[PDB]
Ligand binder design. Structure first.
Ligand SMILES: O=C(O)CCCC[C@H](S)CCS
Length: 362
């Protein structure tokens, strides 16, 4: 499996490993529960160096990105990032991503680990009519997520610049633990937090420095188990599970990242799709302790309406929770049935999204 520059640190910490998107990653160090509460009460640090980073440089960096993504990148000022999806000609979701507007001539794209190759090829195969050069800097770039209500107060003593000045989804170049870093107020937890992008060679040092500060405030390094629990509670999507090229943005609740007033790949397809949204992604709270898995059929009074996309147990709400792609007719308050292996039906209630909102800003 592929190993991030912090693999050795995870091994030393005695973490239980799991294969994620071809990477040997830490599922948890102590327990998924302990790590989730760390994110919810103080701070949890995640190694997300498996994520990819693409750099677009050139006079038409802005128009190129705007042509590729569904969201409005043309308006974004320097130092701002934006969440979005990148669609194919038929409006299917190729991947969701975050794009940083460094300057008129430079943009950085952060994409999912499993889609690095696919995304990069897609992006390169579309640079032809744009005065830009696209490069993949994933191989030498690390990314650390420092999340929690006490994330800012704990991280600040190692950062050369003021963090309070950095707004939600804003970023800046600074120095952390003596090394250059692109610090952003972003996250996948629903709490306040930051992500630290840095040269891979510097990952171990920054990580060690941060670990030292965590043991002081009862914080903890957190694995993928805790990462999934927190994002699901926050009701954030995971490409490959909650959506893929067979779903358009409107079907999974991402209408807000699609700006149809501009031209972009999949635009025409989406105009027609928007007129007939027959599916929606709903939040479910199941009875019992059994956890739903992707693919389990979802029923309404004995009739199928969809299927589970993501499932896990939320210690924050103390319930088995799930996301499910179902027919438009499903509404909040509905009583549904999730079919577990062996045809065993488990009751589930449709609830207003998101399940939980923490200290995350703006
Ligand atoms: O391995 C697991 O059990 C799932 C955790 C997946 C981690 C997060 S939810 C995805 C990274 S974008």
């Amino acid at each position: 499996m592929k190993r991030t520059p912090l693999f050795e640190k995870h091994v030393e910490l005695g973490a239980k490993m799991v294969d994620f998107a071809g990477w040997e990653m830490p599922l948890y160090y102590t327990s998924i529960f302990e790590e989730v509460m760390a994110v919810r009460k103080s701070v949890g640090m995640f190694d997300v160096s498996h994520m990819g980073e693409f750099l677009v440089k050139g006079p038409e960096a802005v128009s190129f990105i705007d042509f590729l993504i569904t969201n409005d990148f043309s308006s974004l000022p320097d130092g701002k990032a934006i969440y979005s999806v990148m669609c194919n000609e038929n409006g299917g979701i190729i991947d969701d991503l975050v794009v940083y507007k460094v300057s008129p001539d430079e943009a950085l794209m952060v994409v999912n680990a499993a889609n690095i190759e696919k995304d990069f090829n897609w992006i390169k195969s579309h640079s032809k009519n744009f005065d830009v050069e696209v490069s993949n800097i994933s191989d030498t770039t690390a990314l650390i997520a420092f999340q929690g209500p006490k994330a800012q107060e704990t991280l600040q003593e190692l950062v050369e610049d003021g963090l309070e000045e950095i707004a939600y989804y804003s970023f800046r170049k600074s120095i952390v633990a003596g090394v250059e870093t692109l610090v952003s107020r972003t996250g996948y937890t629903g709490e306040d937090g930051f992500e630290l992008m840095l040269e891979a060679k510097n990952a171990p040092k920054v990580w060690d420095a941060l670990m030292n500060l965590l043991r002081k405030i009862d914080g903890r390094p957190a694995g993928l188990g805790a990462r999934d629990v927190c994002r699901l509670e926050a009701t954030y999507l995971l490409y490959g599970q909650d959506m893929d090229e067979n779903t358009n943005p409107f079907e999974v609740g991402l209408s807000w990242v699609v700006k149809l007033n501009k031209d972009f790949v999949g635009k025409e397809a989406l105009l027609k799709a928007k007129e007939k949204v027959e599916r929606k992604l709903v939040a479910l709270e199941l009875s019992g302790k059994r956890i739903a898995r992707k693919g389990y059929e979802v029923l309404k009074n004995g009739e199928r309406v969809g299927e589970i996309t993501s499932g896990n147990f939320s210690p924050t709400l103390g319930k088995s929770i799930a996301l499910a792609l179902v027919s438009k007719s499903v509404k909040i308050g509905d009583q549904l049935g999730v079919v577990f292996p062996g045809g065993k039906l488990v009751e589930a209630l449709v609830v207003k999204k998101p399940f939980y909102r923490g200290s995350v800003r703006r």
